[PDB]
Amino acid sequence: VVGWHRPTRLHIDTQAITENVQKECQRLPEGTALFAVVKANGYGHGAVESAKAAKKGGATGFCVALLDEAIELREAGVQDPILILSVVDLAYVPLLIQYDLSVTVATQEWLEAALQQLTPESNTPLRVHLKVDTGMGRIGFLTPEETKQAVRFVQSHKEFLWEGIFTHFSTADEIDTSYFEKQAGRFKAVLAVLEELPRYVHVSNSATALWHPDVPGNMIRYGVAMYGLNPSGNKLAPSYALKPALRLTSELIHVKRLAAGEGIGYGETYVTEAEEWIGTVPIGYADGWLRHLQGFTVLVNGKRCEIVGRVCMDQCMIRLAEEVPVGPVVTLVGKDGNEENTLQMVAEKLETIHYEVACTFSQRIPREYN
Amino acid sequence: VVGWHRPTRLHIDTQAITENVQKECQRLPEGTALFAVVKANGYGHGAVESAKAAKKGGATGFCVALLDEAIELREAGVQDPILILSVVDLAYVPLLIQYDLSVTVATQEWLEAALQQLTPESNTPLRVHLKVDTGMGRIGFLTPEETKQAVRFVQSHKEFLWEGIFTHFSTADEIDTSYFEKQAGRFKAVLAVLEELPRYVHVSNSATALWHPDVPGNMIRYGVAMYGLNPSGNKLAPSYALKPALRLTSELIHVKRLAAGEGIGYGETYVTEAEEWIGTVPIGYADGWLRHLQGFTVLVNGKRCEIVGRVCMDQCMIRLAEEVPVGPVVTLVGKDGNEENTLQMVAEKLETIHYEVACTFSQRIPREYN
Ligand SMILES: Cc1ncc(COP(=O)(O)O)c(CNC2CONC2=O)c1O
Ligand SMILES: Cc1ncc(COP(=O)(O)O)c(CNC2CONC2=O)c1O
């Protein structure tokens, strides 16, 4: 299940994770907390290690997207608050108590149904965070009144404890700020009809924390920035230099001299124009190195090489500058000489964002930590 | 790392894999063997349970890409021949002997090197397969004399065994048979200088087996077709009814009505043209439901539902043409009523081949079998 017996490898610089986190904490008021969102296996970097690295930088809470992803954190030994970011089935409400997990709620219907199968006055309250939809449009309460009604209800039952209320931004990372503020208005107006306020009032994410610090709240969910990736993609400049924590390498496992007019790859989409030194790298699209990456250039001995021909499930072919033996290290993501390949670079070639590139990296790729 | 606590599931139909394998086995010259390639964790369907399904279907051997994948097969109780299709780093020759695995060899250098670490009378010969490149240009011996040299060497030292020779086609699923014929030619030459052949002489794949059933050989490496997927996308009609084995479902976890003029998802790339019902499904690009699936329509109660707004890491919102509570089954790949979502459709919307959609589905998605 994990390709340990193949030179293809992912190196993760956890120190970066800590640095990126520390620096952000230094820009936060003494009252603002920093929760490290490590869902989807730390954006493909590794949950536990990201969490562990995250903590050492000031992290005092973590966010995940699944119940069992949290259990893994609990199991891994993290004893800090863990916030599951999306809705969770009622059948699994007991698991939330057993692991003292914090859950997000978006319907009055959920709470009422949860209220049942919950002891009258449990010695273990259910930590709820109310999600308000102020523009994202995926989950949350749409109305200040509903929001408020939700609160009144959670407040009127000791079997609950709402440690939070929050919302999420859909365009924090954009130059035009108009929609952003409209979302903030919707949040203010829904907090506005509230008497009390929980311990956690969060609204910002990586993008928000960087280009909209003034935004209210005593807690922030730091994501991609943790891994040193500009949230805006390329649109704006982070408030501080982010250190990249993802590195991907492999090596040549076959070298060859091809005559002119030899086709390489499926459907022979490529044909030699002349004498060409072609290298065979053991990484395919099943590893995450997608087919549309064809044409992209990777690194070897500090020189760029083009991926020629169709990328395969388990390998691909690159045009080597000059003869070379089997064994030279192939840098796909990272620095090598003067050349460097950023996930942003991979992303732009893939016409997506690095959030996706990173997750797409299969488990078949062993990850090594500094 | 597996989200069993999230209704997003990947249903696999083993019976179908068996049936796809039997169909071909009966269609086969019966003086031929069927090897089932189950790399990339069974093409996303699950290696061990796919293999076993192919066995009871008539398979008598297995192809994988990594030594690791191979050992899994051994530890699982598979006692049939297991051939590793790519080169395997010299450092693991002893494991090869340990798990009596067959290995691919595409150079003379390697062979004379493996010989070093091989004991004259180890009573365990190194079962090798000599891959000759004829077309497709990834690995293998380029010329006849080169293979003649490789062969005469292997038959010599007798720590080896030489189980077979084979090549791989790059255009077998193409309507135009030119390039194919060429590769077949070059492979005829290769075998033409060897006054002898091994147990296995294979060149056939999914594609070649279906549309070029007469090409020379006594064993085929059946891949994608044993999973029910047209090995050519939609260019050619298979030679027999392939039955899809993969299926993907999830379910509505959030439902709301929005008023005309509301934005959904990141960036605000979508706004309600009027009042409408929006559903939220717990599956995102971290699962392998890539961002470019927007506009694609999934199935709810046999009715099509368009994915609106950007696909999130962990979820996506769809436009429900009705009014429905939470819980109805969301069908992303498979049937519902008279509607059908097939991997091909997914591949076409993604602008690639289903081979990749299947291998991209993440580990986190639980795979249910029968
Ligand atoms: C509710 C919520 N808060 C915070 C975050 C952290 O965001 P950043 O990484 O941008 O700081 C996310 C992840 N949201 C994303 C990002 O990509 N796909 C998603 O579902 C989230 O869903
Ligand atoms: C040498 C070899 N034989 C047989 C197969 C099985 O092919 P089918 O699935 O098409 O029947 C493959 C997989 N080759 C692919 C397919 O995609 N990427 C690869 O490296 C292969 O590499």
mmCIF file with all atom_site columns, N, CA and C in Angstrom, chain A residues 5 39 65 68-69 135-138 168 170 179 186 262 265-268 280 290-292 312-314 351-353 355-356 363-364, chain B residues 2-3 5 39 68-69 136-138 168 170 179 186 254 256 262-263 265-268 280 285 291-292 314 317 351-352 356 363-364:
data_model
loop_
_atom_site.group_PDB
_atom_site.id
_atom_site.type_symbol
_atom_site.label_atom_id
_atom_site.label_alt_id
_atom_site.label_comp_id
_atom_site.label_asym_id
_atom_site.label_entity_id
_atom_site.label_seq_id
_atom_site.pdbx_PDB_ins_code
_atom_site.Cartn_x
_atom_site.Cartn_y
_atom_site.Cartn_z
_atom_site.occupancy
_atom_site.B_iso_or_equiv
_atom_site.pdbx_formal_charge
_atom_site.auth_seq_id
_atom_site.auth_comp_id
_atom_site.auth_asym_id
_atom_site.auth_atom_id
_atom_site.pdbx_PDB_model_num
ATOM 1   N N  . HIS A 1 5   ? 9.651   0.643  -1.378  1.00 0.00 ? 5   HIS A N  1
ATOM 2   C CA . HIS A 1 5   ? 10.682  0.043  -2.210  1.00 0.00 ? 5   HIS A CA 1
ATOM 3   C C  . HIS A 1 5   ? 10.765  0.637  -3.606  1.00 0.00 ? 5   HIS A C  1
ATOM 4   N N  . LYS A 1 39  ? -6.959  18.797 8.243   1.00 0.00 ? 39  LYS A N  1
ATOM 5   C CA . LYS A 1 39  ? -7.777  17.789 7.581   1.00 0.00 ? 39  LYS A CA 1
ATOM 6   C C  . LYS A 1 39  ? -7.121  17.234 6.315   1.00 0.00 ? 39  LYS A C  1
ATOM 7   N N  . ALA A 1 65  ? -11.949 17.517 9.080   1.00 0.00 ? 65  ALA A N  1
ATOM 8   C CA . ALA A 1 65  ? -13.207 17.411 8.349   1.00 0.00 ? 65  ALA A CA 1
ATOM 9   C C  . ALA A 1 65  ? -13.963 16.111 8.518   1.00 0.00 ? 65  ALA A C  1
ATOM 10  N N  . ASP A 1 68  ? -13.527 10.289 12.276  1.00 0.00 ? 68  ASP A N  1
ATOM 11  C CA . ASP A 1 68  ? -12.348 9.454  12.473  1.00 0.00 ? 68  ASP A CA 1
ATOM 12  C C  . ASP A 1 68  ? -10.999 10.158 12.262  1.00 0.00 ? 68  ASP A C  1
ATOM 13  N N  . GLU A 1 69  ? -10.977 11.279 11.536  1.00 0.00 ? 69  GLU A N  1
ATOM 14  C CA . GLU A 1 69  ? -9.725  12.022 11.364  1.00 0.00 ? 69  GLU A CA 1
ATOM 15  C C  . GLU A 1 69  ? -9.386  12.623 12.730  1.00 0.00 ? 69  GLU A C  1
ATOM 16  N N  . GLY A 1 135 ? -22.491 33.735 3.302   1.00 0.00 ? 135 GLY A N  1
ATOM 17  C CA . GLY A 1 135 ? -22.090 33.921 1.918   1.00 0.00 ? 135 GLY A CA 1
ATOM 18  C C  . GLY A 1 135 ? -21.417 32.746 1.235   1.00 0.00 ? 135 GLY A C  1
ATOM 19  N N  . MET A 1 136 ? -20.802 31.856 2.008   1.00 0.00 ? 136 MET A N  1
ATOM 20  C CA . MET A 1 136 ? -20.142 30.688 1.425   1.00 0.00 ? 136 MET A CA 1
ATOM 21  C C  . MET A 1 136 ? -21.210 29.879 0.696   1.00 0.00 ? 136 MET A C  1
ATOM 22  N N  . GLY A 1 137 ? -22.339 29.655 1.358   1.00 0.00 ? 137 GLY A N  1
ATOM 23  C CA . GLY A 1 137 ? -23.416 28.931 0.723   1.00 0.00 ? 137 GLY A CA 1
ATOM 24  C C  . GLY A 1 137 ? -23.377 27.428 0.857   1.00 0.00 ? 137 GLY A C  1
ATOM 25  N N  . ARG A 1 138 ? -22.455 26.892 1.647   1.00 0.00 ? 138 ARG A N  1
ATOM 26  C CA . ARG A 1 138 ? -22.444 25.449 1.799   1.00 0.00 ? 138 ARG A CA 1
ATOM 27  C C  . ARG A 1 138 ? -23.207 24.986 3.038   1.00 0.00 ? 138 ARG A C  1
ATOM 28  N N  . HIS A 1 168 ? -17.540 31.173 7.583   1.00 0.00 ? 168 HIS A N  1
ATOM 29  C CA . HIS A 1 168 ? -16.366 31.037 6.729   1.00 0.00 ? 168 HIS A CA 1
ATOM 30  C C  . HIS A 1 168 ? -16.445 31.901 5.488   1.00 0.00 ? 168 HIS A C  1
ATOM 31  N N  . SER A 1 170 ? -15.666 33.122 1.568   1.00 0.00 ? 170 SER A N  1
ATOM 32  C CA . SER A 1 170 ? -15.516 32.543 0.243   1.00 0.00 ? 170 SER A CA 1
ATOM 33  C C  . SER A 1 170 ? -14.574 33.315 -0.695  1.00 0.00 ? 170 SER A C  1
ATOM 34  N N  . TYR A 1 179 ? -17.468 41.409 -1.650  1.00 0.00 ? 179 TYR A N  1
ATOM 35  C CA . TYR A 1 179 ? -18.250 40.286 -1.151  1.00 0.00 ? 179 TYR A CA 1
ATOM 36  C C  . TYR A 1 179 ? -17.824 39.963 0.271   1.00 0.00 ? 179 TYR A C  1
ATOM 37  N N  . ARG A 1 186 ? -23.093 40.263 7.409   1.00 0.00 ? 186 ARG A N  1
ATOM 38  C CA . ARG A 1 186 ? -24.048 39.231 7.775   1.00 0.00 ? 186 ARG A CA 1
ATOM 39  C C  . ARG A 1 186 ? -23.685 38.541 9.077   1.00 0.00 ? 186 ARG A C  1
ATOM 40  N N  . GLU A 1 262 ? 11.107  8.005  -33.290 1.00 0.00 ? 262 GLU A N  1
ATOM 41  C CA . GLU A 1 262 ? 10.625  6.938  -32.419 1.00 0.00 ? 262 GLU A CA 1
ATOM 42  C C  . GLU A 1 262 ? 9.533   7.535  -31.554 1.00 0.00 ? 262 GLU A C  1
ATOM 43  N N  . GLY A 1 265 ? 5.249   6.856  -25.452 1.00 0.00 ? 265 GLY A N  1
ATOM 44  C CA . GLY A 1 265 ? 3.995   7.061  -24.745 1.00 0.00 ? 265 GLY A CA 1
ATOM 45  C C  . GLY A 1 265 ? 2.784   6.486  -25.462 1.00 0.00 ? 265 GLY A C  1
ATOM 46  N N  . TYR A 1 266 ? 1.650   6.427  -24.763 1.00 0.00 ? 266 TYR A N  1
ATOM 47  C CA . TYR A 1 266 ? 0.416   5.907  -25.351 1.00 0.00 ? 266 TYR A CA 1
ATOM 48  C C  . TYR A 1 266 ? -0.024  6.818  -26.477 1.00 0.00 ? 266 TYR A C  1
ATOM 49  N N  . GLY A 1 267 ? -0.607  6.226  -27.514 1.00 0.00 ? 267 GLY A N  1
ATOM 50  C CA . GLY A 1 267 ? -1.064  6.987  -28.663 1.00 0.00 ? 267 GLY A CA 1
ATOM 51  C C  . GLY A 1 267 ? 0.054   7.748  -29.354 1.00 0.00 ? 267 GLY A C  1
ATOM 52  N N  . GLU A 1 268 ? 1.298   7.384  -29.059 1.00 0.00 ? 268 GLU A N  1
ATOM 53  C CA . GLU A 1 268 ? 2.460   8.052  -29.634 1.00 0.00 ? 268 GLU A CA 1
ATOM 54  C C  . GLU A 1 268 ? 2.196   9.540  -29.860 1.00 0.00 ? 268 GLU A C  1
ATOM 55  N N  . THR A 1 280 ? 13.528  7.419  -17.668 1.00 0.00 ? 280 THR A N  1
ATOM 56  C CA . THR A 1 280 ? 12.265  6.833  -17.239 1.00 0.00 ? 280 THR A CA 1
ATOM 57  C C  . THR A 1 280 ? 12.145  6.971  -15.734 1.00 0.00 ? 280 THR A C  1
ATOM 58  N N  . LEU A 1 290 ? -0.441  13.780 -12.269 1.00 0.00 ? 290 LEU A N  1
ATOM 59  C CA . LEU A 1 290 ? -1.444  13.697 -13.307 1.00 0.00 ? 290 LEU A CA 1
ATOM 60  C C  . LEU A 1 290 ? -0.962  13.828 -14.747 1.00 0.00 ? 290 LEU A C  1
ATOM 61  N N  . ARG A 1 291 ? -1.781  13.282 -15.639 1.00 0.00 ? 291 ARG A N  1
ATOM 62  C CA . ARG A 1 291 ? -1.520  13.269 -17.063 1.00 0.00 ? 291 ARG A CA 1
ATOM 63  C C  . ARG A 1 291 ? -1.379  14.668 -17.679 1.00 0.00 ? 291 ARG A C  1
ATOM 64  N N  . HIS A 1 292 ? -2.192  15.616 -17.235 1.00 0.00 ? 292 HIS A N  1
ATOM 65  C CA . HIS A 1 292 ? -2.098  16.952 -17.798 1.00 0.00 ? 292 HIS A CA 1
ATOM 66  C C  . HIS A 1 292 ? -0.808  17.638 -17.438 1.00 0.00 ? 292 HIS A C  1
ATOM 67  N N  . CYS A 1 312 ? 2.179   7.808  -17.597 1.00 0.00 ? 312 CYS A N  1
ATOM 68  C CA . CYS A 1 312 ? 1.553   6.505  -17.341 1.00 0.00 ? 312 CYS A CA 1
ATOM 69  C C  . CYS A 1 312 ? 1.009   6.423  -15.915 1.00 0.00 ? 312 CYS A C  1
ATOM 70  N N  . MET A 1 313 ? 0.382   5.303  -15.605 1.00 0.00 ? 313 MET A N  1
ATOM 71  C CA . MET A 1 313 ? -0.159  5.101  -14.281 1.00 0.00 ? 313 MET A CA 1
ATOM 72  C C  . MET A 1 313 ? 0.986   5.057  -13.275 1.00 0.00 ? 313 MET A C  1
ATOM 73  N N  . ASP A 1 314 ? 2.066   4.355  -13.616 1.00 0.00 ? 314 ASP A N  1
ATOM 74  C CA . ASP A 1 314 ? 3.194   4.214  -12.696 1.00 0.00 ? 314 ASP A CA 1
ATOM 75  C C  . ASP A 1 314 ? 4.518   4.840  -13.075 1.00 0.00 ? 314 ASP A C  1
ATOM 76  N N  . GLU A 1 351 ? -3.950  23.765 -14.060 1.00 0.00 ? 351 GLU A N  1
ATOM 77  C CA . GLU A 1 351 ? -5.094  24.658 -14.058 1.00 0.00 ? 351 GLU A CA 1
ATOM 78  C C  . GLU A 1 351 ? -5.991  24.481 -12.846 1.00 0.00 ? 351 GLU A C  1
ATOM 79  N N  . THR A 1 352 ? -5.365  24.328 -11.688 1.00 0.00 ? 352 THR A N  1
ATOM 80  C CA . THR A 1 352 ? -6.059  24.193 -10.415 1.00 0.00 ? 352 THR A CA 1
ATOM 81  C C  . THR A 1 352 ? -5.302  25.048 -9.409  1.00 0.00 ? 352 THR A C  1
ATOM 82  N N  . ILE A 1 353 ? -5.408  24.650 -8.153  1.00 0.00 ? 353 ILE A N  1
ATOM 83  C CA . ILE A 1 353 ? -4.736  25.332 -7.075  1.00 0.00 ? 353 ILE A CA 1
ATOM 84  C C  . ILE A 1 353 ? -3.924  24.266 -6.332  1.00 0.00 ? 353 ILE A C  1
ATOM 85  N N  . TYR A 1 355 ? -3.945  23.503 -3.358  1.00 0.00 ? 355 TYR A N  1
ATOM 86  C CA . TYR A 1 355 ? -4.728  22.805 -2.331  1.00 0.00 ? 355 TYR A CA 1
ATOM 87  C C  . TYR A 1 355 ? -5.033  21.418 -2.858  1.00 0.00 ? 355 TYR A C  1
ATOM 88  N N  . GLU A 1 356 ? -5.413  21.364 -4.133  1.00 0.00 ? 356 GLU A N  1
ATOM 89  C CA . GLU A 1 356 ? -5.759  20.106 -4.788  1.00 0.00 ? 356 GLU A CA 1
ATOM 90  C C  . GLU A 1 356 ? -4.542  19.256 -5.138  1.00 0.00 ? 356 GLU A C  1
ATOM 91  N N  . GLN A 1 363 ? -1.284  7.802  -1.139  1.00 0.00 ? 363 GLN A N  1
ATOM 92  C CA . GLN A 1 363 ? -0.675  7.245  0.055   1.00 0.00 ? 363 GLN A CA 1
ATOM 93  C C  . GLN A 1 363 ? 0.459   6.312  -0.352  1.00 0.00 ? 363 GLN A C  1
ATOM 94  N N  . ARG A 1 364 ? 0.448   5.906  -1.621  1.00 0.00 ? 364 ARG A N  1
ATOM 95  C CA . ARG A 1 364 ? 1.478   5.033  -2.174  1.00 0.00 ? 364 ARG A CA 1
ATOM 96  C C  . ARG A 1 364 ? 2.836   5.703  -2.130  1.00 0.00 ? 364 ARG A C  1
ATOM 97  N N  . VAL B 1 2   ? -9.235  6.358  7.133   1.00 0.00 ? 2   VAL B N  1
ATOM 98  C CA . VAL B 1 2   ? -10.403 5.934  6.354   1.00 0.00 ? 2   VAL B CA 1
ATOM 99  C C  . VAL B 1 2   ? -11.673 6.494  6.988   1.00 0.00 ? 2   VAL B C  1
ATOM 100 N N  . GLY B 1 3   ? -12.426 7.274  6.227   1.00 0.00 ? 3   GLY B N  1
ATOM 101 C CA . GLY B 1 3   ? -13.632 7.868  6.774   1.00 0.00 ? 3   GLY B CA 1
ATOM 102 C C  . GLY B 1 3   ? -14.882 7.012  6.845   1.00 0.00 ? 3   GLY B C  1
ATOM 103 N N  . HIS B 1 5   ? -16.942 7.027  9.089   1.00 0.00 ? 5   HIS B N  1
ATOM 104 C CA . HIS B 1 5   ? -17.984 7.802  9.740   1.00 0.00 ? 5   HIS B CA 1
ATOM 105 C C  . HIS B 1 5   ? -18.559 8.910  8.878   1.00 0.00 ? 5   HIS B C  1
ATOM 106 N N  . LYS B 1 39  ? -2.320  -3.511 -10.013 1.00 0.00 ? 39  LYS B N  1
ATOM 107 C CA . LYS B 1 39  ? -1.517  -2.463 -9.385  1.00 0.00 ? 39  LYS B CA 1
ATOM 108 C C  . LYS B 1 39  ? -2.371  -1.259 -9.025  1.00 0.00 ? 39  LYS B C  1
ATOM 109 N N  . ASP B 1 68  ? 6.504   -3.761 -3.505  1.00 0.00 ? 68  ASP B N  1
ATOM 110 C CA . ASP B 1 68  ? 5.622   -3.609 -2.355  1.00 0.00 ? 68  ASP B CA 1
ATOM 111 C C  . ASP B 1 68  ? 4.269   -4.230 -2.653  1.00 0.00 ? 68  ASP B C  1
ATOM 112 N N  . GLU B 1 69  ? 3.701   -3.870 -3.801  1.00 0.00 ? 69  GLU B N  1
ATOM 113 C CA . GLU B 1 69  ? 2.394   -4.385 -4.202  1.00 0.00 ? 69  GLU B CA 1
ATOM 114 C C  . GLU B 1 69  ? 2.454   -5.900 -4.253  1.00 0.00 ? 69  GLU B C  1
ATOM 115 N N  . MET B 1 136 ? 6.467   2.690  -27.741 1.00 0.00 ? 136 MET B N  1
ATOM 116 C CA . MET B 1 136 ? 5.919   3.179  -26.482 1.00 0.00 ? 136 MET B CA 1
ATOM 117 C C  . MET B 1 136 ? 7.010   3.781  -25.603 1.00 0.00 ? 136 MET B C  1
ATOM 118 N N  . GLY B 1 137 ? 8.231   3.276  -25.755 1.00 0.00 ? 137 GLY B N  1
ATOM 119 C CA . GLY B 1 137 ? 9.413   3.995  -25.317 1.00 0.00 ? 137 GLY B CA 1
ATOM 120 C C  . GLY B 1 137 ? 9.358   4.360  -23.846 1.00 0.00 ? 137 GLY B C  1
ATOM 121 N N  . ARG B 1 138 ? 9.359   3.345  -22.989 1.00 0.00 ? 138 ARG B N  1
ATOM 122 C CA . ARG B 1 138 ? 9.501   3.556  -21.553 1.00 0.00 ? 138 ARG B CA 1
ATOM 123 C C  . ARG B 1 138 ? 10.645  2.708  -20.980 1.00 0.00 ? 138 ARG B C  1
ATOM 124 N N  . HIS B 1 168 ? 5.052   -4.162 -24.711 1.00 0.00 ? 168 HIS B N  1
ATOM 125 C CA . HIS B 1 168 ? 3.810   -3.494 -24.402 1.00 0.00 ? 168 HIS B CA 1
ATOM 126 C C  . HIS B 1 168 ? 3.442   -2.555 -25.528 1.00 0.00 ? 168 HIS B C  1
ATOM 127 N N  . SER B 1 170 ? 1.477   0.700  -27.368 1.00 0.00 ? 170 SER B N  1
ATOM 128 C CA . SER B 1 170 ? 1.132   2.060  -26.996 1.00 0.00 ? 170 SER B CA 1
ATOM 129 C C  . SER B 1 170 ? -0.071  2.590  -27.749 1.00 0.00 ? 170 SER B C  1
ATOM 130 N N  . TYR B 1 179 ? 0.788   1.966  -36.160 1.00 0.00 ? 179 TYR B N  1
ATOM 131 C CA . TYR B 1 179 ? 1.811   1.867  -35.136 1.00 0.00 ? 179 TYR B CA 1
ATOM 132 C C  . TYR B 1 179 ? 1.772   0.496  -34.475 1.00 0.00 ? 179 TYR B C  1
ATOM 133 N N  . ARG B 1 186 ? 8.450   -5.464 -34.995 1.00 0.00 ? 186 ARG B N  1
ATOM 134 C CA . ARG B 1 186 ? 9.693   -5.438 -34.236 1.00 0.00 ? 186 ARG B CA 1
ATOM 135 C C  . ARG B 1 186 ? 9.776   -6.572 -33.217 1.00 0.00 ? 186 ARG B C  1
ATOM 136 N N  . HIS B 1 254 ? -26.829 18.368 4.164   1.00 0.00 ? 254 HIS B N  1
ATOM 137 C CA . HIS B 1 254 ? -27.347 19.719 4.385   1.00 0.00 ? 254 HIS B CA 1
ATOM 138 C C  . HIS B 1 254 ? -28.265 20.139 3.235   1.00 0.00 ? 254 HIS B C  1
ATOM 139 N N  . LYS B 1 256 ? -30.965 23.479 2.006   1.00 0.00 ? 256 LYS B N  1
ATOM 140 C CA . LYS B 1 256 ? -31.471 24.803 2.266   1.00 0.00 ? 256 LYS B CA 1
ATOM 141 C C  . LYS B 1 256 ? -32.094 25.381 1.016   1.00 0.00 ? 256 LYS B C  1
ATOM 142 N N  . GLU B 1 262 ? -27.869 34.890 -4.571  1.00 0.00 ? 262 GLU B N  1
ATOM 143 C CA . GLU B 1 262 ? -26.926 34.481 -3.533  1.00 0.00 ? 262 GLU B CA 1
ATOM 144 C C  . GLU B 1 262 ? -25.737 33.709 -4.111  1.00 0.00 ? 262 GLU B C  1
ATOM 145 N N  . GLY B 1 263 ? -24.537 34.044 -3.648  1.00 0.00 ? 263 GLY B N  1
ATOM 146 C CA . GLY B 1 263 ? -23.349 33.363 -4.130  1.00 0.00 ? 263 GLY B CA 1
ATOM 147 C C  . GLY B 1 263 ? -23.060 32.072 -3.387  1.00 0.00 ? 263 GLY B C  1
ATOM 148 N N  . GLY B 1 265 ? -20.056 28.801 -2.854  1.00 0.00 ? 265 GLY B N  1
ATOM 149 C CA . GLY B 1 265 ? -18.699 28.357 -3.052  1.00 0.00 ? 265 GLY B CA 1
ATOM 150 C C  . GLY B 1 265 ? -17.673 29.450 -3.196  1.00 0.00 ? 265 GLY B C  1
ATOM 151 N N  . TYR B 1 266 ? -16.417 29.037 -3.070  1.00 0.00 ? 266 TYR B N  1
ATOM 152 C CA . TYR B 1 266 ? -15.260 29.908 -3.159  1.00 0.00 ? 266 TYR B CA 1
ATOM 153 C C  . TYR B 1 266 ? -15.248 30.800 -4.383  1.00 0.00 ? 266 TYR B C  1
ATOM 154 N N  . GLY B 1 267 ? -14.737 32.013 -4.205  1.00 0.00 ? 267 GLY B N  1
ATOM 155 C CA . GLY B 1 267 ? -14.655 32.964 -5.297  1.00 0.00 ? 267 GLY B CA 1
ATOM 156 C C  . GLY B 1 267 ? -15.971 33.621 -5.666  1.00 0.00 ? 267 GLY B C  1
ATOM 157 N N  . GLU B 1 268 ? -17.076 32.932 -5.406  1.00 0.00 ? 268 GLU B N  1
ATOM 158 C CA . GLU B 1 268 ? -18.398 33.439 -5.741  1.00 0.00 ? 268 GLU B CA 1
ATOM 159 C C  . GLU B 1 268 ? -18.632 33.222 -7.227  1.00 0.00 ? 268 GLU B C  1
ATOM 160 N N  . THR B 1 280 ? -25.781 19.815 0.087   1.00 0.00 ? 280 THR B N  1
ATOM 161 C CA . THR B 1 280 ? -24.347 19.764 0.333   1.00 0.00 ? 280 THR B CA 1
ATOM 162 C C  . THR B 1 280 ? -23.955 18.313 0.541   1.00 0.00 ? 280 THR B C  1
ATOM 163 N N  . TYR B 1 285 ? -12.429 17.409 -3.472  1.00 0.00 ? 285 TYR B N  1
ATOM 164 C CA . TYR B 1 285 ? -11.271 17.064 -4.258  1.00 0.00 ? 285 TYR B CA 1
ATOM 165 C C  . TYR B 1 285 ? -10.199 16.308 -3.501  1.00 0.00 ? 285 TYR B C  1
ATOM 166 N N  . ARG B 1 291 ? -11.833 19.540 -8.661  1.00 0.00 ? 291 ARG B N  1
ATOM 167 C CA . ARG B 1 291 ? -12.486 20.815 -8.874  1.00 0.00 ? 291 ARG B CA 1
ATOM 168 C C  . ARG B 1 291 ? -13.101 20.989 -10.254 1.00 0.00 ? 291 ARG B C  1
ATOM 169 N N  . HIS B 1 292 ? -12.546 20.347 -11.270 1.00 0.00 ? 292 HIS B N  1
ATOM 170 C CA . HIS B 1 292 ? -13.138 20.512 -12.591 1.00 0.00 ? 292 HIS B CA 1
ATOM 171 C C  . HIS B 1 292 ? -14.406 19.723 -12.805 1.00 0.00 ? 292 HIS B C  1
ATOM 172 N N  . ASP B 1 314 ? -13.332 19.243 0.997   1.00 0.00 ? 314 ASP B N  1
ATOM 173 C CA . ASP B 1 314 ? -14.175 18.214 1.612   1.00 0.00 ? 314 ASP B CA 1
ATOM 174 C C  . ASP B 1 314 ? -15.653 18.095 1.269   1.00 0.00 ? 314 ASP B C  1
ATOM 175 N N  . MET B 1 317 ? -21.549 21.655 -3.295  1.00 0.00 ? 317 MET B N  1
ATOM 176 C CA . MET B 1 317 ? -22.981 21.904 -3.298  1.00 0.00 ? 317 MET B CA 1
ATOM 177 C C  . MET B 1 317 ? -23.607 21.728 -4.672  1.00 0.00 ? 317 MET B C  1
ATOM 178 N N  . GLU B 1 351 ? -11.569 15.583 -18.775 1.00 0.00 ? 351 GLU B N  1
ATOM 179 C CA . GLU B 1 351 ? -10.701 15.755 -19.934 1.00 0.00 ? 351 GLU B CA 1
ATOM 180 C C  . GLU B 1 351 ? -9.509  14.805 -19.876 1.00 0.00 ? 351 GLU B C  1
ATOM 181 N N  . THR B 1 352 ? -9.719  13.636 -19.281 1.00 0.00 ? 352 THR B N  1
ATOM 182 C CA . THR B 1 352 ? -8.710  12.582 -19.285 1.00 0.00 ? 352 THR B CA 1
ATOM 183 C C  . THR B 1 352 ? -9.381  11.229 -19.499 1.00 0.00 ? 352 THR B C  1
ATOM 184 N N  . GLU B 1 356 ? -7.407  7.196  -14.817 1.00 0.00 ? 356 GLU B N  1
ATOM 185 C CA . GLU B 1 356 ? -6.986  8.181  -13.816 1.00 0.00 ? 356 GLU B CA 1
ATOM 186 C C  . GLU B 1 356 ? -8.035  8.563  -12.780 1.00 0.00 ? 356 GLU B C  1
ATOM 187 N N  . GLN B 1 363 ? -7.632  7.185  -0.494  1.00 0.00 ? 363 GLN B N  1
ATOM 188 C CA . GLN B 1 363 ? -7.660  6.065  0.437   1.00 0.00 ? 363 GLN B CA 1
ATOM 189 C C  . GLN B 1 363 ? -8.771  6.290  1.455   1.00 0.00 ? 363 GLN B C  1
ATOM 190 N N  . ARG B 1 364 ? -8.957  7.555  1.831   1.00 0.00 ? 364 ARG B N  1
ATOM 191 C CA . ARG B 1 364 ? -9.960  7.923  2.820   1.00 0.00 ? 364 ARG B CA 1
ATOM 192 C C  . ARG B 1 364 ? -11.371 7.470  2.488   1.00 0.00 ? 364 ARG B C  1
#
